């Protein structure tokens, strides 16, 4: 009966907890205590692109580490040239409520979405010299929050309907769907192998999906509030998520548990974006407290500050070759550190 | 600088176009609609005519009013309410047919992002309220007074006014029975007063 099912669930949870606690022979902090620290890292602003008029909600690097795309709530999605701070394109939108962006790995497509429950696709290499909407996917009920290109013919989306689905930019149909989240999904990230991807809902939990067989594998918990960002370690074996409880955490896939906690007493604001480095040594996190921090990824100690913004930072992301850093805030300014 | 001059010219031209469009598109007056399900929003939105964001724009007395409705979003309000920080006002509609509406009004009045946007208050089904009174202390067990139409309506209005905590914002009122189309005039007057106050406070003299 119901009591039997509840007892079985409790026994399964007990087995999972015991297996997770068994593997924690020693902590990462003890092992990393002997290794030398990195000292102090100082970074200075190199450029500043002033084109937008309203708040900025996304910024995605190109595949060649040269071009960038920035999406704002003014109804525009400009395309930048990092090395000379030049505008190359300008794409007006039908809806002014957009809170996502993406940039194709081959450099021929741009995707946007928002509060209208529709994911758009744009064509950059038309023969008539203009940008034309090739497709407009539909079928999601809740607001779309994130979307990434697997390749030139597929796209994965995470919407507010507590579901994630895999599309097809050729026929525009939901090929597969993923279920298991009891709250809004506000963060999605795909592995470098482009075969697995993890997502973060708004009920303090993160799960790992499989694109091929279309089902869940594992569930990680331990936060206290709604997760707002997620990313992958370059090795593809660990991921770090920063919740609204002012604490970033590091999760190991094989160990099936957490490793380190990143907390500072002076900071109480909730993280809005996280991103690793090329060698996996710096975890440059953005904060709602008008500044950015550069945590050492192994010793859990701070190593600098990217101060300079006049409002909350809503995005951050390093390049492909780990040479620059781009952050955009609600003051309508994008700054390229180095 | 062999042919980068052409790219620079293109960038300058599109920047100029962006600035021109941004300035030309900033003269509209935004608004917002909140309330319960079928609590009078339908009557007002049908009176002036014309599942995500639903937008309407009608030009009245040389002022372009844009109206939004977000009733179709069945999710937590704390995840998208910050997008509407810059609205010029907020329109709230309540019906006297029935804590359901006062709780949401108190929540929206005390929100951090809305410490300066005024709320225009509309009441609906006044004669229906009188009929229900004839057929009012159940909805207000703490009501210490006679069960008469005038006193009950006035005390409920005072309860609406009591939830305010921020002096910087003002709450108006208007009575209606979901059968009149005079709301345009009162919206116009409230909006022009709010515009004057906001501009003067921006200049710092207010």
């Amino acid at each position, epitope marked *: 009966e119901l009591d039997q099912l509840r007892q079985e669930a409790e026994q399964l949870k007990n087995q999972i907890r015991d297996a997770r606690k068994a593997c924690a022979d020693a902590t990462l902090s003890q092992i990393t205590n002997n290794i030398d620290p990195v000292g102090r890292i100082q970074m200075r602003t190199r450029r500043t692109l002033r084109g937008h008029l309203a708040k900025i909600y996304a910024m995605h690097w190109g595949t060649d580490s040269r071009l960038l795309v920035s999406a704002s709530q003014d109804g525009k999605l400009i395309i930048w040239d990092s090395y000379t701070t030049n505008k190359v394109h300008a794409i007006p939108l039908r809806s002014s409520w957009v809170m996502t962006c993406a940039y194709a790995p081959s450099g021929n497509y741009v995707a946007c979405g928002g509060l209208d429950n529709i994911c758009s696709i744009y064509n950059l290499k038309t023969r*008539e010299g203009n940008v034309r909407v090739s497709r407009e996917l539909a079928g999601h009920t809740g607001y779309l929050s994130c979307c990434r290109f697997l390749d030139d013919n597929q796209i994965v989306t995470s919407s507010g309907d507590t579901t994630c689905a895999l599309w097809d930019i050729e026929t525009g149909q939901q090929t597969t769907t993923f279920t298991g989240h009891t709250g809004d999904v506000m963060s999605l990230s795909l592995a470098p192998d482009t075969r697995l991807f993890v997502s973060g809902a708004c009920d303090a939990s993160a799960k790992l999906w499989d694109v091929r067989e279309g089902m869940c594998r594992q569930t990680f918990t331990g936060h206290e509030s709604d997760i707002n960002a997620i990313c992958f370690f370059p090795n593809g074996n660990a991921f770090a998520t920063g919740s609204d409880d002012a604490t970033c955490r590091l999760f190991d896939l094989r160990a099936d548990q957490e490793l380190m906690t990143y907390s500072h007493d002076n900071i109480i604001c909730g993280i809005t974006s996280v991103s690793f480095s090329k060698s996996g040594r710096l975890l440059l996190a953005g904060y709602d407290d008008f500044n950015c921090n550069v945590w050492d990824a192994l010793k859990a100690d701070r190593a600098g500050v990217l101060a300079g913004h006049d409002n909350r930072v809503s995005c951050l992301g390093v390049t492909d070759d780990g040479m620059a850093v781009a952050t955009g805030s609600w003051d309508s300014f994008l700054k390229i550190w180095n | 600088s062999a042919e980068e001059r052409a790219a620079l010219e293109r960038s300058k031209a599109i920047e100029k176009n962006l600035k021109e469009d941004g300035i030309s598109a900033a003269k509209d007056v935004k608004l917002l609609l909140l309330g319960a399900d079928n609590s009078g929003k339908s009557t007002i939105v049908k009176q002036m005519k014309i599942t995500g964001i639903v937008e309407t724009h009608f030009t009245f007395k040389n002022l372009h009013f844009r109206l939004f409705d977000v009733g179709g979003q069945r999710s937590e309000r704390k995840k998208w309410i910050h997008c509407f920080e810059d609205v010029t006002a907020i329109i709230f509609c309540v019906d006297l047919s029935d804590h359901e509406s006062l709780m949401l009004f108190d929540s929206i009045c005390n929100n951090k992002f809305f410490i300066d946007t005024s709320i225009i208050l509309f009441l609906n089904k006044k004669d229906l309220f009188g009929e229900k009174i004839k057929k009012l202390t159940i909805c207000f067990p703490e009501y210490t007074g006679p069960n008469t139409y005038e006193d009950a309506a006035a005390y409920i209005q005072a309860q609406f006014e009591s939830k305010n905590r921020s002096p910087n914002k003002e709450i108006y009122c208007h009575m209606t029975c979901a059968t009149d189309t005079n709301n345009a005039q009162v919206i116009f007057d409230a909006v022009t007063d709010i515009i004057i106050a906001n501009n003067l406070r921006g200049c710092g003299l207010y």
Partner: single-chain antibody
Amino acid sequence: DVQLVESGGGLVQPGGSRKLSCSASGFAFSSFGMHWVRQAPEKGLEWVAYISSGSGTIYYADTVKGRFTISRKNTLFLQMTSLRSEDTAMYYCVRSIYYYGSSPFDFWGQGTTLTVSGSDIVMTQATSSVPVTPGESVSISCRSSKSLLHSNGNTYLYWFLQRPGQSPQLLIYRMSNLASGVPDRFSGSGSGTAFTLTISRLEAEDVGVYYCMQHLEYPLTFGAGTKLEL
């Protein structure tokens, strides 16, 4: 689809004047630069005029300055005055759009036959004529006066193909990239001064004449032209 039809050519007495038009349809003509290139009955290609987007910048060649004027719906003009003997040619119309990653000199018109009764980078092609049978691999070389390897790391050499009885088509732009629609058989390379294009598995349709062009700084000078005929 895309078409640049044009007309306005005919026999004109010496010292006269004539107007030519280059009608354009099928694309966004409002943001595309327009050139004008001419070709004598026997000699190779030359350069005449150019107008940018928005009429901001206009250039002219050495022998045409003052005489002709280029002016810009979806119609382009070129006023001609004081015709002389050397003016007889078949003028073409060429579009071009410039930004990071663009492909200038993409589409060519069809031509309007007209008859009348130093600091310049010089390009040389030694192989005036080359006899090659089908089924073999060929190679053509274009040399220059000044190095075309700018400090940015980009070279500004262009290679054109003009089949018999047609209009030229772009084959290789910036000395290393292949334009859209061209099969991967053609390949071009080089460094600084010596440029060489490599053609693999020559087919019958590849017969024609090949031209070499630079884009470092105006004016633009074509090569002499190599005839890789059968």
